[PDB]
Structure formats: C-alpha cells, structure tokens
C-alpha cells in the first residue's frame with residue numbers, strides 16, 4: 301500500500317507544473333529565507349496545496365513537517381474550533397531552529413465575512429512566529445483586510461500538455477506501459493484534476509497489464 305498521489309507529490313517548487321509565474325516569485329522567497337503571509341487563489345485541483353507543501357520543504361529542509369500544519373478553514377464546527385487549533389499549534393516555538401511555522405488554511409473563502417474577521421485576528425495575534433497560507437477559489441471572496449495582509453498568487457488551470465508530460469514521467473518511474481489512446485482516455489477522465497488522474501493511473505497499473513482506454517473506463521466504473 302503506497303499512494304502515488306503522495307509518492308509523486310512535488311518535493312520542491314520546481315516540481316510543480318503549470319504555474320510558472322507563481323513558482324518563480326515563490327522561489328525568490330526561498331532564496332531570501334522568508335515569506336510574508338500568503339494568499340493562494342485558483343480553481344480546485346490546480347496545485348495550491350501541493351505548492352504550499354513544496355514551499356515548506358524548500359524553506360525548512362527534510363524536517364519540514366515539524367513546522368507545518370494543514371487544516372480546513374470550513375470545518376463544520378465553526379471558526380472558533382479552527383481558531384483553537386491554530387492557537388495550539390502556534391504556542392510552541394518553531395522546532396529545529398526554523399525561523400517560523402507555517403499554517404496552511406484550505407477553503408478560507410467558504411468563511412462568512414464574520415468568521416474571516418475572527419480569523420484575521422488570530423492571524424495578527426501570531427504574525428511573528430507563524431506564517432499563514434490561505435487557500436481560496438476566488439480572491440473576491442476574501443475580505444479586504446486579509447487580501448492586503450497577504451502576498452497574492454493566482455493559480456491557473458493546468459494545460460493538457462502539462463498533465464500529459466507529468467503522467468508520462470510517473471509511468472516511466474513505475475514501469476507502466478500505457479498506449480497512446482489509454483493516455484488520452486486517462487486525460488479525458490481527469491477533468492483537469494491531477495489527483496483523480498494519478499489515482500486512476502495507479503488502479504489501472506495494479507491490474508498488471510498494458511493500460512489502454514478500456515482499462516481506464518474499467519477503473520473509472522469501479523470508482
């Protein structure tokens with residue numbers, strides 16, 4: 301049991317695909333060994349979480365998990381639960397001499413404007429010791445006080461070519477034999493989503509044979 305979604309997750313910023321503008325800017329922050337609070341904006345599955353993790357790794361080295369946490373801001377128990385979690389993580393010093401800790405907050409734009417103000421307090425309460433990376437689908441859905449407190453990064457849909465080239469790399473690494481039409485079927489099914497595509501590729505490969513379009517629809521009927 302191995303999940304290729306994780307085995308083939310970007311380990312460094314250069315390994316994120318289809319977001320070159322954002323990556324160049326982000327790499328300059330690692331060069332300077334510091335980030336401001338960050339707002340990542342774009343369609344689901346474009347790699348916002350992946351680039352946050354790749355940034356943490358570049359910033360902190362192999363012990364990055366010690367100083368990085370992920371949580372969903374739209375927790376069904378309300379903003380005060382999320383805010384409590386943030387307090388707990390924040391109140392110990394960074395581990396291993398890292399300059400700060402990173403909190404990735406997913407789906408921050410599903411917060412009401414009230415919750416967002418609440419969350420903006422907590423964010424300010426910890427600005428020296430922690431850095432926040434907020435994820436959202438639309439900038440316009442994040443309150444102005446948060447927008448101006450952050451460097452903004454707009455993620456774009458990843459092009460078919462970029463997905464194709466990456467899936468091929470993964471096939472090469474795992475010794476998967478896939479036909480041309482199999483690869484086209486896999487891209488079709490992806491819907492632009494790398495997680496869906498890689499999951500399907502792993503299931504198709506587990507069969508043990510040449511992967512074609514029929515194997516793709518078979519995997520996908522059993523989703």
Ligand SMILES: Nc1ncnc2c1ncn2[C@@H]1O[C@H](COP(=O)(O)OP(=O)(O)NP(=O)(O)O)[C@@H](O)[C@H]1O
Pocket residue numbers: 304305306308309310315316317318319343344345346347348349350351435458466494495498
């Ligand atoms: N832009 C990208 N470049 C390379 N791999 C990606 C990209 N986006 C997603 N992936 C892969 O898809 C899987 C999950 O991506 P990840 O960004 O962690 O979550 P996500 O929910 O798909 N993205 P997002 O909705 O933007 O937070 C991992 O295998 C990544 O390797």
Ligand SMILES: [Mg+2]
Pocket residue numbers: 344345
């Ligand atoms: Mg997502």
